[PDB]
A paper describes a structure:
Despite its sequence conservation with the two other structural homologs, we found that the [NiFe]‐containing FRH from M. thermolithotrophicus (MtFRH) exhibits a dynamic equilibrium between a dodecameric and dimeric state in solution, as highlighted by size exclusion chromatography and native polyacrylamide gel electrophoresis (PAGE). It was therefore not surprising to observe several crystalline forms containing either a dodecameric cubic organization (MtFRHcube) or only a single FRH dimer (MtFRHdimer1 −3). In crystallo spectroscopy on hydrogenases was recently established to verify the redox state of the active site in crystal structures and was applied to the MtFRHdimer3 due to the abundance of crystalline material and the attainable crystal size. RR spectroscopy on MtFRH crystals confirmed the presence of oxidized [4Fe–4S] and [2Fe–2S] clusters. The overall intensity of the Fe–S bands and observation of [2Fe–2S]+ specific signals indicate a more oxidized electron transfer (ET) chain in the as‐isolated state compared to MbFRH. Moreover, IR and RR spectroscopy confirmed the presence of the Nia‐S state, previously observed in MbFRH. This state was postulated to be mandatory for the thermodynamically favorable binding of H2 and corroborated the vacant position observed in the crystal structure. IR spectra recorded at different temperatures and exposure to intense illumination did not significantly impact the spectroscopic pattern, excluding temperature‐dependent shifts of the redox state equilibria or the presence of a light‐sensitive species, as observed recently in other hydrogenases. In comparison to known and well‐characterized [NiFe]‐hydrogenases, the crystals turned out to be mostly redox‐inert.
FRHs catalyze the reversible H2 oxidation coupled to the reduction of coenzyme F420 (8‐hydroxy‐5‐deazaflavin, ΔG°′ = −10 kJ mol−1). The overall reaction requires three components: the large subunit (FRHA) that harbors the [NiFe] center and oxidizes H2, and the small subunit (FRHG), which contains three [4Fe–4S] clusters to transfer electrons to the flavin adenine dinucleotide (FAD) located in the F420‐reducing module (FRHB, harboring an additional [4Fe–4S] cluster). FRHABG dimerizes and forms dodecameric assemblies of about 16 nm in diameter with a spherical shape and a hollow core. Here, by characterizing the native hydrogenase from the marine methanogen Methanothermococcus thermolithotrophicus (belonging to the Methanococcales order), we provided an unprecedented functional understanding of this enzyme via a synergistic approach of biochemistry, X‐ray crystallography, and spectroscopy.
Author numbering:
A (entry chain F), E (entry chain B): 1 to 282
B (entry chain E), D (entry chain C): 2 to 241
C (entry chain D), F (entry chain A): 2 to 393
Write the structure that this text describes.
């Protein structure tokens, strides 16, 4: 079982702008990439996740850095980022689009490009495809129940959530930090994620994540020639701080264990569905 | 190779989509031989003179390699019925080009009664009468999708076309395909790529799931083909 | 004393038939041009369906000019329900229709190129045409959502709006299209004026002459007030063809004051730009000159457009179940008419369409008469016919 | 014989329709043995007592002859999955009762997200998981069609149930069935019986042909079943 | 093959009320039965066709005797008579409904009654099923072409269309009578009638038609026990004038020749559809 | 010191669970009645769908009371768009709701008959229930279109007018139903008053007591003015059950002024007919008496009904996309609430439903406390619980 798919280099990195770091989940790689492209004419639009005061997510095309800043942080709830990909190249008029999405949404983008039936003049305009790691998603009302009725903190007063370290973590604006075992957070997950076998967004230009890298830092896979040229251009400009993933802890060994834990667990779900007669992607 | 564009009960939009390869249409036409296309070439002209009349017919030539059949078949018109069986007889590979030929498309709503042929009421995809080898959905399929099918057919890329060769055996499409085969089957994760593929904008992402405005759906099949939890061949995981 | 039948005619859209009665010298004495394309029957299946489905469905009349029917459909539903589209939506709508006419006319010049363009100039001529069409299709892509079947054309105006960036792009694309149009027009006008094909055969001076009037309501868009739709009466094929030919025709026979009328570029150029030439060559010339008129009006709409102005009306789609709304639009082929009556629930209770080529088919039948039958098809193509359109 | 009413993700309306045999429901219940029905009988009670808990469970009994399975299967609820396989295990004849069990019906529109089980978003007809022997479409099937099915099952009228035993293999239904299989196939003659059968009044006869108001269709299957150009076994031609 | 199906007797007959004969097509059998049943409580509602001043038909639940008179006569155009059968027993509240229809619409009625899935509380309320003979139907705009363009009579000036004798006959309100070879009418007929194998309405309680009997009279098949009781009740009440089909000409030999002609012609179409792969009822 | 779990509970609609904490003598100390029925999720898939689809869809909450959800839906959409149904349509709608309650109450008396009706009287008792139900379902067939899921219940009123024939048939059947109601009522009220089951078991005098108030807006139909919906708050099952029990509950927990409330026949009979008895037998008694109230109001409506009066409002379904329409209806089980927000195009933008038994479920949890657990199921059935309704 391969753990990461194809990639050129694995890196632990972080954004150089302090504004980004104050607003980002981990190392601010997505926001850093989007803002750099926009500011340097590499991109003219980017798909982002806008969040309502109560953490509801709405897809949006972005043409201003402020917009990118207005939407930095992880909402552990389903946001259809690819639903706006055509709108981006039509009315918005983008020709150098940036797209972000969980590994699945990246899979949708790659198929969307190879068989562009309903995507006339879309594929050529995709200028950078950023993938974020993902283990499991949740319906909004499911995450609402965990945070509010299992963790005490009310959604509005939530400021940052994070899974790992053995369980779920909700960080309150006011200052408290609550944790509940990850074993109780299972009943409320999107069950269509139990057939997903991509952890590190193996088909993105650039994949970025939290695990394997310390707090405030992001594990960054560089996969495609396009992602490499973009990633390098940022480094030569000083938009990123870069350390080898070997020199950093916990390191790639953690990504590998979480990735192959997802794959081995969900591959057994796939075989269970096949066994009882339910459809599985092929 | 020899290719021909058969126009049944369509609107020529699929042909225009191919024409929207723009200046690359010369590279496509220069890579094959356009042997028949009523919209483009005067083929195959055959003059039959009796003592009463001169009949100048443009007929479908024999030994066609790839037939791009566009439109549906009208069961009550004999010339339509005849052209579809001729396309299969004379062509080695029949491509159901466009939703009309592949799944019926807009013509599924036909119920006839209009002048000046009020008995014209029954339109079927070409798969309901002849064997189809490849099917391109959408209304119309994108110029980029067409180029890939043409390039894959010239180059014998069997793997790429497998998804379309599998579609040829499917003669019915709807926006309900997403419900019946994805949402109802605990496979939808809410990317929204389906909503972007629709040419009539009939799909609307609501709470991370597709909602199909069924009265705007023209049964084109672009969303069913797009959704990556239906078909996802290993071929797609290939990038550099 | 013989019958010449050409079937199907070629290098136009769709499926027709020429049935000619010629004398011994080949001169057409009685002409008949008729559609034999099956009747998909849009005016009859739309009844019972919601109004917003009309511009989606009628757009499938034809893939060359889909915008013209979408435009005419919503204008007819807006008229039936007393809906007024906002200024900037009406400007984008017109821009979308002009973008469509910006690819149709070069496309037609490409179809007729085997007859008029020398073979050595073919590749460059096709390249220039396709460069023009790419700009035209991009305008329909940006404004309409799709080039072929534009889903933004809605009852109320235009669904989406464009960014100043996009507007600025189209304005620059239009200036380059205007360059290509001058190149194209400086090349073809001499050929059309010579009246000789590329193989050397000279065309008769009176080629395609006829005695009928014209119908055009606007130079670039459409104006329902310039026509008295009560004087428009549709007759049957039995009223223009011989009985054995009439049963084959799929189209109706539209008349204004009980007379055939020609529509199309020359119809518009006659009414608005004092163009008075008759025949088939004048038809190719007016179409070629109209390319400059379109692109100029496109840049004139962009200079007038407010990219942040409202595009969709907030009025609801409610009719009284009686008013026969009128929706006219100057398609690339000519005066295009849709009519629809809508009930209180926004549903279609009657629908009818009189497409441009529907007007010209019976005019073409007469225009081929008087000249040899080997020139008949050249008279047909001068009318840029679209048959799946004329049949709907 | 032993019959049982299994209630999955349904509305009980199918059971109420059987109750709408009125006083003849006692002639039905006396010709068979109602061995299980949570709505009606306290079966099959099994008491397990530990030192901390008394577990009074009503389980589906063994040796069921005919199982009237009503409602669809929720793929994310484990008790729903367990009960549908339990019904196939313990029943000789499995009847997909109602459109929900037969073709999904109204639950085809479910897309989850509602409290207090927001992961419940995938509903399938029982045919997508177990083997179905007979299927009754409609929402609900009329009491008369039920009486006829039960009588034919008890009397071994295999000929009468053939059309229903054929439906058991069909897990999808829609008003489009009339278009795809009749109107588009030059079979529709304009009776209008398909319009009279529709429980939601979604079919409207316009100019001698049906028009489906697709947003008012619950995918029940009654119209597709009634149409005489689809199925017309000779059995119908018998009159006295 | 068999030509008429099951019947008890076959008799030439016509109504006794001559108001009926003023308005009917042939013998006035349908209206006579409806009006008799209504007047004598055997029927409380009857499905009839309300034609339009341009002969556009409309199905209708009639309850009053005079209504029955406004639907008398043949409109050789499709009329969905069965489409109102439920509305007849719901809001209209009928319990002794009479239904009329071509053999195909009677077939639908018999299936409607045997598999009443969508027809709750309907079968038991059908009191009389009257079938009318039928050879071929037409779309309205098809018949409009036959009458207006081949017979030169405006649908408005149309009075009584009829077929037979080898041609279609249009009788004008103003006196003229036109005839065109049936050959000309065949291109306009609804192509779904070419799979119909029922000429004499073989599944109706009572079937009545024009062929076989003389002008002003009607061939009447009495088939079921229900139809026999209704028919006998009318003859003892004097509502019908009755003569044996053997003493009347052309007689049962014409119906037979026409019934089998249809069967052999269309059975070929059925076998042609099977051959090329189209669906055919079974 | 023991837990008692009954699962599933029987002779009510749907799928529930009893989870009781009982002392060493079997007396319930902490009660838990909860739905485990899967959540089909109507309020969430209706968003995005047209308004006229609501009464069709929400009718499928349940086949026993579908008329109550169709009525509440159209009332909520009419409230959201300021549509006023015509006088005679509102009468037919109320009649359709009353005919539906005329089948439910006898049905429930049939469900509980194995506990209360002697085995020798069973057949004749059931025959009388089914004779009554037939009449109630006939009223729903005639007026509503179908007895199970009435499609005539529409936004704007009722789709179809009946005939004077149909009206008179119903009035005569209502006179016969009233005769059956007296026979039934005179037979059951003495049984319910005895507090002894059919096997001789005496039920505790305080069986099913509780401390909560009632909600009832009308005796036979509904009145949105008689409740302040702002004071109605839905809470989560964690706020009433233990955590290991809460995660299994499928319903929400409605409260009025932060308190649980009982709905249903006794709730109605307390407000409108000064019925003050507590406990579970009072519920069976109130439900039995309401049968006479219903059929007597049905004949009062028929007397008032104008068979030829308009039944559908001509107003269009157009909302402002903000107003939260309120639709209440006294279902057979009690106050049934639906809410809807409608946009300008007639599409649902938000939908919510607080069904009757959704109210009664957390009340049953408390009502079973204090008495032995062998009586818990008899307390449940006194509330005629419909669970597929309470879950939707
Ligand atoms: C449901 C979910 C589960 C995840 N699980 C894991 C995990 O198990 N392990 C792990 O290492 N990482 C996981 N991630 C990713 C992780 O939480 C961070 O988003 C990422 O690792 C670092 O982001 P960043 O700081 O580099 O960029 P940032 O500057 O923080 O910006 C984050 C970007 O992500 C986008 N985004 C936010 N929410 C969503 C969403 N729901 N869907 C799509 N796009 C979104 C926003 O548009 C934003 O631009 C998950 C993310 C999601 C949404
Ligand atoms: C399309 C068509 C084709 C026919 N072909 C033949 C034929 O080939 N040979 C033959 O012998 N008879 C044929 N008939 C029947 C014949 O024309 C007479 O209708 C028949 O004799 C019964 O008329 P009557 O005088 O007995 O009844 P009347 O008292 O005249 O009443 C006639 C009844 O016919 C009903 N009706 C009229 N039009 C329709 C319609 N479109 N659909 C359903 N019901 C309708 C009216 O509601 C009315 O109740 C045909 C009828 C139709 C509609
Ligand atoms: N131009 C054009 Fe169409 Ni294809 C034609 N003819 C019209 O409205
Ligand atoms: N009565 C009732 Fe339903 Ni089946 C419940 N509980 C509601 O509106
Ligand atoms: S686990 Fe897979 S399917 Fe689920 S949200 Fe993450 S990437 Fe998508
Ligand atoms: S698929 Fe669409 S574009 Fe192609 S022929 Fe059919 S209607 Fe025209
Ligand atoms: S929903 Fe859209 S993409 Fe899918 S079949 Fe319908 S029209 Fe085509
Ligand atoms: S493309 Fe497939 S997985 Fe993505 S939102 Fe649409 S149906 Fe769901
Ligand atoms: S088929 Fe209809 S009546 Fe039967 S359970 Fe499903 S929703 Fe209820
Ligand atoms: S059209 Fe009516 S009868 Fe047919 S499937 Fe839909 S709801 Fe059922
Ligand atoms: S039941 Fe069948 S034949 Fe009759 S109208 Fe409906 S689809 Fe046509
Ligand atoms: S020929 Fe048959 S299918 Fe056609 S109208 Fe007559 S009875 Fe019906
Ligand atoms: S199949 Fe019927 S609307 Fe989709
Ligand atoms: Fe027309
Ligand atoms: Fe709720």
């Amino acid at each position: 079982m391969d753990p990461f798919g194809k990639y050129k280099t694995v890196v632990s990195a972080r954004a150089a702008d302090k504004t980004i770091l104050k607003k980002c989940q981990d190392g601010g790689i997505v926001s850093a990439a989007y803002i750099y492209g926009l500011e340097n004419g590499l991109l003219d639009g980017v798909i982002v996740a806008d969040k309502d005061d109560k953490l509801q997510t709405t897809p949006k095309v972005a043409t201003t850095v402020d917009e990118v800043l207005e939407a930095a942080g992880t909402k552990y709830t389903v946001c259809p980022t690819i639903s706006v990909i055509k709108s981006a190249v039509r009315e918005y008029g983008c020709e150098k689009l940036g797209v972000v999405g969980t590994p699945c949404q990246i899979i949708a983008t790659r198929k969307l490009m190879k068989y562009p039936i309903g995507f006339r003049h879309v594929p050529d305009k995709l200028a950078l495809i950023v993938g974020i790691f993902c283990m499991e998603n949740f319906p909004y009302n499911g995450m609402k129940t965990i945070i509010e009725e299992h963790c005490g903190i009310k959604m509005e007063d939530v400021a940052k959530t994070d899974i790992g370290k053995g369980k779920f973590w909700v960080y309150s604006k006011w200052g408290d930090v609550k944790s509940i075992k990850l074993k109780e957070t299972h009943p409320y997950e999107q069950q269509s994620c139990h057939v997903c076998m991509d952890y590190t967004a193996e088909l993105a230009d650039i994949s970025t994540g939290s695990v394997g890298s310390p707090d405030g830092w992001s594990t960054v896979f560089i996969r495609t020639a396009q992602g490499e040229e973009f990633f390098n251009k940022m480094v030569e400009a000083g938009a990123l701080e870069v350390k080898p993933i070997e020199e950093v802890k916990p390191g790639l060994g953690l990504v590998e264990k979480l990735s192959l834990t997802k794959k081995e667990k969900n591959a057994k779900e796939i075989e269970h569905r096949k066994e009882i007669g339910l459809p599985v992607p092929y | 190779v020899k290719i021909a564009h058969i126009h049944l009960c369509g609107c020529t939009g699929c042909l225009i989509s191919l024409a929207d390869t723009y200046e690359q249409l010369l590279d496509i036409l220069n890579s094959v031989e356009l042997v028949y296309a009523l919209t483009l070439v005067d083929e195959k002209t055959e003059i039959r003179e009796t003592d009463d009349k001169i009949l100048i017919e443009r007929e479908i030539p024999d030994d066609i390699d790839i037939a791009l059949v566009e439109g549906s078949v009208c069961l009550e018109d004999e010339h339509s019925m005849k052209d579809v069986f001729d396309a299969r007889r004379k062509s080695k590979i029949v491509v159901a080009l466009g939703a009309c030929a592949a799944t019926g498309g807009i013509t599924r709503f036909c119920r006839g009664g209009q002048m000046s042929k009020p008995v014209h009421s029954s339109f079927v995809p070409i798969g309901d009468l002849i064997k189809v080898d490849l099917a391109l959905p959408g209304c119309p399929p994108s110029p980029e999708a067409l180029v890939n099918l043409i390039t894959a057919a010239l180059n014998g890329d069997t793997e790429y076309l497998e998804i379309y060769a599998e579609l040829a055996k499917k003669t019915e499409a709807c926006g309900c395909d997403l419900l019946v085969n994805v949402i109802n089957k605990s496979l939808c994760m809410g990317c929204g790529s389906c909503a972007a593929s629709c040419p009539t904008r009939a799909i609307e992402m609501i709470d991370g799931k597709p909602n199909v405005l069924k009265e705007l759906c023209i049964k084109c099949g672009a969303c069913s083909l797009q959704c990556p939890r239906i078909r996802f061949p290993k071929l797609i995981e290939e990038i550099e | 004393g013989k019958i010449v039948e050409i079937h199907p005619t070629t290098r136009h859209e769709g499926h027709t038939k020429l049935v000619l009665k010629v004398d011994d010298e080949g001169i057409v004495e009685k002409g008949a041009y008729l559609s034999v394309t099956p009747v998909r029957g849009f005016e009859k299946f739309l009844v019972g369906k919601p109004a917003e489905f009309a511009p989606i469905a009628v757009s499938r009349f034809c893939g060359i000019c889909p915008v013209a029917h979408a435009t005419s459909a919503v204008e007819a539903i807006e008229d039936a329900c007393d809906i007024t589209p906002p200024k900037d939506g009406l400007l984008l709508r017109e821009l979308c229709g002009i973008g469509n006419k910006m690819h149709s006319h070069p496309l037609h010049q490409f179809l007729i190129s085997p007859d008029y363009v020398p073979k050595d100039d073919s590749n460059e001529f096709i390249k220039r045409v396709q460069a023009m069409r790419r700009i035209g299709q991009y305008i329909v892509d940006a404004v309409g959502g799709e080039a072929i079947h534009s889903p933004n054309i809605k009852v109320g105006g235009m669904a989406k709006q464009i960014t100043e960036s996009t507007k600025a792009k189209m304005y620059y694309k239009c200036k380059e299209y205007e360059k290509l149009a001058k190149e194209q027009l400086e090349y073809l006008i001499p050929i059309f004026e010579s009246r000789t094909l590329n193989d050397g055969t000279e065309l008769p001076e009176k080629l395609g002459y006829h005695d009928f009037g014209y119908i055009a309501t606007h130079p670039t868009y459409g104006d329902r007030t310039k026509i008295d739709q009560d004087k428009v009466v549709e007759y049957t094929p039995f009223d223009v063809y011989d009985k054995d030919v009439a049963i084959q025709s799929s189209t109706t026979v539209p008349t204004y004051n009980g007379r055939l009328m020609e529509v199309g570029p020359r119809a518009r150029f006659s009414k608005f730009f004092d163009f008075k030439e008759k025949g088939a060559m004048a038809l190719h010339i007016a179409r070629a000159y109209e390319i400059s008129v379109l692109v100029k009006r496109a840049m004139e709409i962009l200079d007038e457009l407010n990219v942040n102005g409202k595009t969709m009306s907030d009025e609801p789609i409610v009719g009284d179940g009686e008013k026969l709304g009128l929706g006219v639009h100057e398609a690339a082929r000519g005066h295009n008419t849709h009519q629809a009556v809508i009930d209180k629930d926004g549903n279609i209770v009657y629908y009818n369409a009189i497409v441009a080529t529907t007007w010209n088919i019976p005019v073409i039948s007469k225009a081929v008469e008087g000249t040899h039958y080997k020139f008949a098809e050249h008279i047909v193509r001068a009318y840029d016919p679209c048959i799946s359109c004329a049949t709907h």
